[PDB]
RNA sequence: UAACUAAGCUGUAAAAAGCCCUAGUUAAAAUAAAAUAACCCACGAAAGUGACUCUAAUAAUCCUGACACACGAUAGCUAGGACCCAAACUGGGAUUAGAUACCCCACUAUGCCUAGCCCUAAACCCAAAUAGUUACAUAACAAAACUAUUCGCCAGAGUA
RNA sequence: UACACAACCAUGCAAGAAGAGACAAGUCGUAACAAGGUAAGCAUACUGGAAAGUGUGCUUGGAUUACC
RNA sequence: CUGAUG
């Protein structure tokens, strides 16, 4: 997890000269300690786009939009961890995840190398949409488990039978 | 310009040393924010009385 | 100024008000905030009789504390000020100066809306 | 106008509700009798699987819980 | 809940019933709700939201698109808590030939908070979404008539 | 050779339960169509021989007669 | 204030 220091000297007051010559009373007010959550969001977005992307000026890229939405997704998850019954933020998060997955699909279809690097850097495990979207009910789950166990038992008994037959052939070919 | 302006405001801040001074300064220099308006659009302050 | 503390202190003597403001600013400085200024709005009559700390308050001294504070201590300062018997009603708001005065364009002449009904002959 | 059909549907729904209130417990008996046969048919369809697959008995560690007879 | 005063208070077109531990004034917690501003039309996907303050925050470099996922007013259920006030039900008092109703009084579930369900509306703006036009052109009324890509529906009525 | 072997369905009957419909005429009330004499209807809960009544939200498929 | 039916 990322941990921005309280004295990060946020981007709005970072590129200008004469920032380390002022006193601590001014630096502490111009830092992230007296800042809001949007300032931390901007700091995380900048620090992630500077290390994951290759051209931070090309914001219109799918690889940049994926990072900009990943920051918001992680912030919404941090919000959900404190607020449980918040339905609007939960819907926002569940739709932002779907938008990020759609853009991941587009990036995988356009440039495979950038997609594979984005996934490895952001930890997003791109899952392929499973066809035949169905609600797994109790009957279907029980029948599938039964069929799986029956298949395993049948193949196990057939393997044991083949082993016994191989042993009986080896004992009969010798004498 | 914002940084230079904030630098000037840091000169009059209240600290552990200036606490006892600012308390007795504010308790003897009261302030007022009451100001009315007119139909023409001009403001008046009761400090003129 | 970022935040603003409207403090309503009980009508007491000059050294008592001085010590009350001293301890309040000391608590605000311990909670991680630097006080910019302090303005006494004078001891005026309360618009209504406030009942706080099992006391019927009829008058009260108004104080205005503009400062910078992180978003994590606003509730702690309010909890500290609530349990103070010399504080009648504390309020922690945003300072009205951080909202830049946008351009009041003026009374834009809005015409009467048309095309609300068909052209059928009555 | 349309209130004719509205009141017609209202009266039909009201009569259905009154019939349900009058024959409530008979409907519950029929529901239990249908769920029983449902569970029995499910049990037989499960038992047919391994019998057509070659297994003589049920696989080890199989309980076949009740999915329709779940109490409220 | 305490203190002064009076034998009356509430109650309808008229009464009765109920309360006379009642009624007015002065003070007074806990709970529920949030006058005027609002001739405002904003926010949110919809339901929904307008007593104050603070923190978080309101997706998509933005097409349509399910039976999948996630929400979904009041009303209903379970457990714990709260209960001023209103009231399903119920008990009384009127009226009626009858009134298990509209009228009056008392009272309960419930409306209130947390957690978990139920997933329903005239969920109507009865007008689907996306980008546009004023060309031809009034079944009637109503909110005037329409384009191109779509999604989901519509085969007489009752039965339902 | 070693096992389940009428379970599962379909076709008729069934003591019976309930509903819907048509079928000149009845009994008991008047629910809605007019501010149908209590304005209606939707979801839901309760109650009543019955149409229905009531409570909580919702729409006008109703007006509030328009210098009133 | 109330007044059912054809
Ligand atoms: Mg019918
Ligand atoms: Mg009496
Ligand atoms: Mg109480
Ligand atoms: Mg209010
Ligand atoms: Mg909107
Ligand atoms: Mg947006
Ligand atoms: Mg879409
Ligand atoms: Mg109660
Ligand atoms: Mg009451
Ligand atoms: Mg009664
Ligand atoms: Mg409820
Ligand atoms: Mg619901
Ligand atoms: Mg609605
Ligand atoms: Mg419709
Ligand atoms: Mg004509
Ligand atoms: Mg659509
Ligand atoms: Mg049909
Ligand atoms: Mg009338
Ligand atoms: Mg009638
Ligand atoms: Mg009526
Ligand atoms: Mg009626
Ligand atoms: Mg009547
Ligand atoms: Mg009517
Ligand atoms: Mg009604
Ligand atoms: Mg109903
Ligand atoms: Mg009743
Ligand atoms: Mg009643
Ligand atoms: Mg009408």
Render A94-138 in DSSP notation, one character per residue.
Answer: HHHHHHHHHHHHHHHHH-HHHHHHHHHHH----PPPPSS-----H
Query: C113 C-alpha to center of ligand 14: Å?
Result: 29
Bridge partner residues of C52 (DSSP):
C55
> B: neighbours with 3+ CB pairs under 8 Å?
A, C
Q: How many CB atoms lie within 10 A of CB A14?
A: 13
Which residues, 6 or more positions from B43, have their beta carbon under 8 angstroms from its beta carbon? B35, B36, B37
CA D23 to centroid of chain Cα atoms: 17
The Cβ-side half-sphere exposure at C9, using a 13 Å CA radius, reads 24
Q: How many CB atoms lie within 10 A of CB C5?
A: 24
Q: How many CB atoms lie within 10 A of CB C53?
A: 13
B37 touching A (Cβ < 8 Å): no
- Give the three-state DSSP class for A16: coil
Going by C-alpha positions, the residue among D35, C73, C35 that lies closest to residue B13 is: C35
**Residue A108 CA distance to nucleotide E98 C1' (Å):** 82
Give the length of chain A. Answer: 175
Statement: the CB of D24 is under 7 Å from strand F: no
- Give the three-state DSSP class for C62: strand
- What whole-number distance in Å separates Cα of residue D67 and Cα of residue D45? 14
Query: C118 C-alpha to center of ligand 10: Å?
Result: 55
- What whole-number distance in Å separates Cα of residue C7 and Cα of residue C67? 13
Tell me whether residue A68 is exposed, middle or buried, using C-beta atoms within 10 angstroms of its C-beta: 0 to 12, 13 to 18, 19 or more. Answer: middle
A34 touching B (Cβ < 8 Å): no
Q: What is the resolution of this structure in A?
A: 4.2
Going by C-alpha positions, the residue among A102, A105, A122, A147 that lies closest to residue A52 is: A122
C7 close to C87: Cβ distance less than 8 angstroms = yes
Going by C-alpha positions, the residue among C58, C62, C40, C36 that lies closest to residue C49 is: C58
The Cβ-side half-sphere exposure at D31, using a 13 Å CA radius, reads 8
Going by C-alpha positions, the residue among C34, C30, C37, C36 that lies closest to residue C76 is: C30
Evaluate the CA torsion angle A129, A131, A137, A142 in order and state its sign: negative
- What whole-number distance in Å separates Cα of residue A67 and Cα of residue D55? 54
Which residues, 6 or more positions from A143, have their beta carbon under 8 angstroms from its beta carbon? D45, D46, D49
- Ligand located closest to C120 CA: 15
With an 8 Å Cβ cutoff, are B23 and C14 in contact? no
User: Closest nucleotide (CA of C119 to C1')?
Assistant: E144
Structure-determination technique: cryo-EM
| Touching pair A, C by Cβ (3+ pairs < 8 Å) | yes
Q: Nearest CA to CA, how far is C83 from chain B (Å)? A: 22
- What whole-number distance in Å separates Cα of residue C37 and Cα of residue C31? 17
Is residue D2 annotated as involved in ligand binding?
Answer: no
With an 8 Å Cβ cutoff, are C69 and A28 in contact? no
DSSP class of residue C87 equals: B
Which residues, 6 or more positions from A58, have their beta carbon under 8 angstroms from its beta carbon? A64
Bridge partner residues of C53 (DSSP):
none
Q: Nearest CA to CA, how far is B34 from chain C (Å)? A: 10
> A: neighbours with 3+ CB pairs under 8 Å?
B, C, D
For D59, which of A138, A142, A153 is closest by C-beta distance? A153
A70 close to A47: Cβ distance less than 8 angstroms = no
Angle between helix C14-30 and B19-26 (nearest 10): 130
Write the Ramachandran bin of B41: left for phi over 0, alpha for psi from -120 to 50, otherwise beta. left
What six digits make up the tokens of D32? 């239990």
Nearest Cα residue in chain C from A29? C68
What six digits make up the tokens of A58? 């090309």
Distances (CA, A) of A115 to A96, A109, A121: 18, 9, 10
Which residues, 6 or more positions from C87, have their beta carbon under 8 angstroms from its beta carbon? C7, C8, C9, C10, C20, C24, C52, C81
C17 touching B (Cβ < 8 Å): yes
Which residues, 6 or more positions from C11, have their beta carbon under 8 angstroms from its beta carbon? C43, C57, C58, C59, C60, C61
Query: A98 C-alpha to center of ligand 7: Å?
Result: 10
Tell me whether residue C13 is exposed, middle or buried, using C-beta atoms within 10 angstroms of its C-beta: 0 to 12, 13 to 18, 19 or more. Answer: exposed
- What whole-number distance in Å separates Cα of residue C65 and Cα of residue A11? 29
DSSP class of residue C46 equals: E
Residues of chain D with Cβ-Cβ distance to A136 below 8 Å are none
Q: Nearest CA to CA, how far is D3 from chain A (Å)? A: 39
Which residues, 6 or more positions from C66, have their beta carbon under 8 angstroms from its beta carbon? C1, C3, C4, C5, C35, C36, C37, C39, C95
Nearest Cα residue in chain A from D44? A143
Parallel, antiparallel, or unpaired for β C55-68 and C34-52? antiparallel
């Amino acid at each position: 997890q990322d941990d921005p220091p309280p004295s990060m000297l946020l981007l709005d007051y970072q590129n200008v000269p004469g920032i380390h010559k002022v006193d601590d009373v001014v630096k502490r007010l111009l830092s992230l300690e007296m800042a809001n959550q949007k300032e931390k969001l901007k700091i995380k977005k900048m620090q992630l786009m500077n290390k994951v992307l290759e051209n931070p000026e090309d914001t219109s890229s799918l690889e940049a939009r994926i990072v900009a939405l990943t920051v918001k997704i992680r912030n919404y998850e941090e919000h959900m961890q404190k607020h449980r019954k918040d339905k609007a933020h939960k819907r926002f998060l569940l739709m932002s995840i779907d938008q990020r997955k759609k853009m991941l699909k587009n990036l995988r279809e356009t440039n495979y190398a950038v997609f594979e690097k984005i996934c490895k850097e952001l930890g997003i495990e791109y899952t392929f949409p499973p066809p035949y979207h169905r609600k797994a009910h109790r009957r279907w789950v029980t029948k599938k488990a039964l069929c799986t166990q029956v298949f395993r038992e049948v193949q196990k008994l057939k393997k044991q039978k083949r082993a016994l037959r191989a042993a009986a052939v080896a004992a009969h070919k010798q004498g | 310009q914002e940084v230079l302006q904030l630098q000037e405001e840091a000169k009059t801040f209240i600290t552990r040393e200036n606490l006892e001074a600012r308390v007795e300064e504010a308790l003897d220099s009261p302030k007022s924010y009451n100001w009315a308006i007119t139909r023409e659009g001009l403001v008046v302050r009761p400090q003129q009385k | 100024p970022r935040y603003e503390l409207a403090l309503i202190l009980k009508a007491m003597q000059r050294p008592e008000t001085a010590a009350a403001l001293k301890r309040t600013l000391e608590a605000l400085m311990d909670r991680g905030a630097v006080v910019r200024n302090l303005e006494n709005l004078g001891e005026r009559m309360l618009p209504y009789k406030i009942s706080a700390h099992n006391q019927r308050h009829s008058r009260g001294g108004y104080f205005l504390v503009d400062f910078y504070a992180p978003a994590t201590t606003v509730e702690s300062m309010m909890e500290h000020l609530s349990r103070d018997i010399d504080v009648i009603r504390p309020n922690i708001v945003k300072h009205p100066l951080t909202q830049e005065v946008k351009e009041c364009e003026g009374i834009v002449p809005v015409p009467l809306e048309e095309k609300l009904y068909s052209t059928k002959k009555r | 106008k349309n209130i004719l059909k509205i009141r017609r549907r209202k009266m039909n729904h009201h009569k259905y509700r009154k019939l349900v209130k009058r024959t409530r417990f008979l409907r519950r008996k029929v529901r239990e009798g249908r769920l029983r046969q449902k569970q029995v048919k499910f049990e037989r369809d499960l038992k047919r699987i391994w019998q057509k697959a070659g297994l003589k008995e049920a696989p080890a560690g199989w309980q076949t819980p009740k999915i329709y007879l779940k109490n409220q």
